[PDB]
Design a protein around this ligand. Structure first.
Ligand code: 4QF
Length: 369
């Protein structure tokens, strides 16, 4: 294929995110950057930190332009503070272009960088509406499309030391099998989508579909888990427990407070159910479903394989994190305001699936207002 040089451009450590090499400034300064569809800022570590192997040195870059404005980005689990500026940016294993982009130089942080993750910055690929300090700070992808002829689309193949591909400007047919099924991007802020039905081993969870998207459902490459709103998490855990009753697990396992380990190569994948998420399709009353295996929602943490239940509670809507994305080739079709899912080219009894079409009525009632 024509996008061959972008294949395998992602690396990472299990549960520590996927990173791409990005070259900043003049002379070049290459750093490993977290690929995050759940945020909108391009920000790099710019001062020594115990968890950083390297950092951006603005004084060494002749093309760096200080924007003379600070920036602060807080989250529930951590935060960072820095200085705004612009500099020349290229992705050596990405598109063959160089752009002048906004860059936040991280000078201080709290619980943001991960010890041993091998990444030193973050590439927020979501929209300007959630950019900090505000929506006037143009995200990297917007700068890329405005300054070059690169098509307004990117796609991600995250393979569960990890690897993957970020194809910028198109779709690589070698990265998937079967058909690509599209769900609309409801609103351009996060990559917001609509889940219309949930099944555990083919059994309908039978909740009002508004609950699946309360207060939003997002596609986020930067979040490890499948995060579910409290009511949905509780019903989904109750159903998963019942479907996996051939073995008993402590309550704390389902809450992520306890891990369960098995002798190398003996994990009884067959005892755990498959999870199906139905997404709103592109045609009236049409939906499709994506099916997740336990190999995706049970994440590996000697002669023992330890696992964490990677489905967790949220009070800020559903988050379809790397747990969900890892079974699929995911297309962020920004030009047509849609997200595509296909079976990824990366057991003997079951496989992750993308199936359709299904008839689902009143799907418009599933969205939060
Ligand atoms: C950007 C952050 C935002 C993120 C999820 C992960 N990415 C990526 C990431 C960053 C650092 C380390 C690991 C992942 C988040 N996302 C929410 C989704 C729902 C709607 C509200 C936002 N909440 C958090 O607390 N996060 C977080 C997690 C760890 C460290 C950190 F500093 C922040």
């Amino acid at each position: 294929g024509s996008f061959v040089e972008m294949v395998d451009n992602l690396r990472g450590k299990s549960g520590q995110g996927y990173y791409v090499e990005m070259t900043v400034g003049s002379p070049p300064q290459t750093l490993n950057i977290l690929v995050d569809t759940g945020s909108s800022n391009f920000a790099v570590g710019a001062a020594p930190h115990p968890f950083l192997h390297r950092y951006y040195q603005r004084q060494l870059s002749s093309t760096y332009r200080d924007l003379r404005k600070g920036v602060y980005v807080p989250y529930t689990q951590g935060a960072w503070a820095g200085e705004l500026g612009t500099d020349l940016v290229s992705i050596p294993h990405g598109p063959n272009v160089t752009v002048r982009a906004n860059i936040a130089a991280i000078t201080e942080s709290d619980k943001f960088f991960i010890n041993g993750s091998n990444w030193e910055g973050i590439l927020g690929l979501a929209y300007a509406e959630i950019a900090r300090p505000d929506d006037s700070l143009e995200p990297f992808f917007d700068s890329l499309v405005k300054q070059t002829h690169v098509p307004n689309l990117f796609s991600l193949q995250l393979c569960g030391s990890v690897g993957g591909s970020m194809i910028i400007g198109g779709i690589d047919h070698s990265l998937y099998t079967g058909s690509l099924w599209y769900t609309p991007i409801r609103r351009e802020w996060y990559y917001e989508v609509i889940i219309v039905r949930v099944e555990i081993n083919g059994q309908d969870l039978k909740m009002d579909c508004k609950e699946y998207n309360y207060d939003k459902s997002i596609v986020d490459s930067g979040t490890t888990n499948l995060r579910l709103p409290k009511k949905v998490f509780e019903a989904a855990v109750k159903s998963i427990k019942a479907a996996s009753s051939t073995e008993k697990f402590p309550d704390g396992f389902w809450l992520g407070e306890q891990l369960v380990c098995w002798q190398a190569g003996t994990t009884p994948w067959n005892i755990f159910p498959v999870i199906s998420l139905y997404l709103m399709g592109e045609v009236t009353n049409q939906s499709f479903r994506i099916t997740i295996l336990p190999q995706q929602y049970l994440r590996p943490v000697s002669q023992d394989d330890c696992y964490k239940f990677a489905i967790s509670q949220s009070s800020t809507g559903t988050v379809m994190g790397a747990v969900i994305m890892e079974g699929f080739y995911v297309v962020f079709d920004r030009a047509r305001k849609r997200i595509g899912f296909a079976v990824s080219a990366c057991d003997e009894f079951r496989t992750a699936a993308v199936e359709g079409p299904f008839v689902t009525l009143d799907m418009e009632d599933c969205g939060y207002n």
